[PDB]
C-alpha cells in the first residue's frame, strides 16, 4: 500500500509499505530515502505521535494515508 510521509519543512516522499509494518519498520524505510537513522525520527498521524512497536493497521493508516516526520535530535 502506498503512503506519503511529509516533513514539516516542506518535503513529501512516497513509500510502499505493508499494513503489518511496525512504525520502526517505516522509519527504516524512511532512512533509505532520507538518510536520517530511525532513532532521530518521530512519525505522526492524525495529530498524534506514533509508537515504534505499533503497526500501521493499529493506527488506521491505510492506502494513501499521509504521515508527518519530525526530527528528534539529542541536543540538536
Swiss-Prot record:
The record marks 68 as: Essential for function. Exists either covalently attached to another protein, or free (unanchored). When covalently bound, it is conjugated to target proteins via an isopeptide bond either as a monomer (monoubiquitin), a polymer linked via different Lys residues of the ubiquitin (polyubiquitin chains) or a linear polymer linked via the initiator Met of the ubiquitin (linear polyubiquitin chains). There is a cross-link at residues 6, 11, 27, 29, 33, 48, 63 (Glycyl lysine isopeptide (Lys-Gly) (interchain with G-Cter in ubiquitin)). It is a peripheral membrane protein. Phosphorylated at Ser-65 by PINK1 during mitophagy. Phosphorylated ubiquitin specifically binds and activates parkin (PRKN), triggering mitophagy. Phosphorylation does not affect E1-mediated E2 charging of ubiquitin but affects discharging of E2 enzymes to form polyubiquitin chains. It also affects deubiquitination by deubiquitinase enzymes such as USP30. Mono-ADP-ribosylated at the C-terminus by PARP9, a component of the PPAR9-DTX3L complex. ADP-ribosylation requires processing by E1 and E2 enzymes and prevents ubiquitin conjugation to substrates such as histones. It is found in: Cytoplasm; Nucleus; Mitochondrion outer membrane. The chain holds residues 1 to 76 of 229 of the full protein. There is a cross-link at residue 76 (Glycyl lysine isopeptide (Gly-Lys) (interchain with K-? in acceptor proteins)). The modification ADP-ribosylglycine is found at residue 76. Residues 1-76 form the Ubiquitin-like domain. The record marks 54, 72 as: Interacts with activating enzyme. This is Ubiquitin. The gene is UBB. The modification Phosphoserine is found at residue 65. It comes from Homo sapiens (Human). The modification (Microbial infection) ADP-ribosylthreonine is found at residue 66.
